């Protein structure tokens, strides 16, 4: 399927967390590192979205609305995917892998446990890269922004990506004629986990102890 092949080639290079080796380990260090990484990933996500067939033909306001609604789901899906061959650890980046103990220290035990639940589900389904990239695009298109100008164009973008998923599954997974639907049925937990992450980091923002860069702040403010 061509849309799937295109999404695979459009998949961005990974980036490094680069935690500051001169700074003592603390909750503030961990959270600063993650927020800094997210800020840089957000730049990469914006560039990636322009490769999705039809996205750039939407008005700028609608492009903004989709990204404002979906950004954390896209970030989370990336962590989930990188974590699939790991056990009880989350690969935020190749140089930043959080186990349970580190999650507790960062005050992220509940959030990271929910992300691990998504990992566990996809592990059991043997999620493939083809399926990952297609679901990332579907999460963007299906992000439920209240502010869409051209609802019919957004529905068509949803349709295009949904068709690519169904087609991929029909060709590659004849053994399970419901596999496309099972993939779509993982989106509620992704949405739930994203909401949790957004609310947690917004609280962190309000508390004022973790410095945050401007893009990350902009995207956080737009969501709450």
């Amino acid at each position: 399927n061509k849309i799937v092949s295109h999404l695979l080639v459009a998949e961005p290079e990974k980036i490094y967390a680069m935690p500051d080796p001169t700074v003592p380990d603390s909750d503030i260090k961990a959270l600063t590192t993650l927020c800094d990484l997210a800020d840089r990933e957000l730049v990469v996500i914006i560039g990636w979205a322009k490769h999705i067939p039809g996205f750039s033909t939407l008005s700028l306001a609608d492009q903004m609305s989709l990204l404002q609604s979906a950004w954390m789901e896209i970030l989370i899906l990336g962590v989930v995917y990188r974590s699939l061959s790991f056990e009880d650890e989350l690969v935020y980046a190749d140089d930043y892998i959080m186990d349970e103990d580190q999650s507790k220290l960062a005050g992220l035990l509940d959030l990271n446990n929910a992300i691990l639940q998504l990992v566990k589900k996809y592990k059991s389904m043997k999620l493939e890269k083809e399926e990952f990239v297609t679901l990332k695009a579907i999460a963007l298109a299906n992000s439920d922004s209240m502010h869409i100008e051209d609802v019919e164009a957004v529905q068509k973008l949803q349709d295009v990506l949904h068709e690519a998923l169904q087609d991929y599954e029909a060709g590659q997974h004849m053994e399970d004629p419901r596999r496309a639907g099972k993939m779509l049925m993982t989106l509620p937990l992704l949405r739930q986990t994203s909401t949790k992450a957004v609310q947690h980091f917004y609280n962190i923002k309000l508390e004022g102890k973790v410095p945050m860069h401007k893009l990350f702040l902009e995207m956080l403010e737009a969501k709450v």
Binding site: G47, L60, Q63, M64, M219
Partner: peptide, 10 residues
Amino acid sequence: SLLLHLLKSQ
């Protein structure tokens, strides 16, 4: 404005 800037960029 930053999201908008980046969407317009390159």
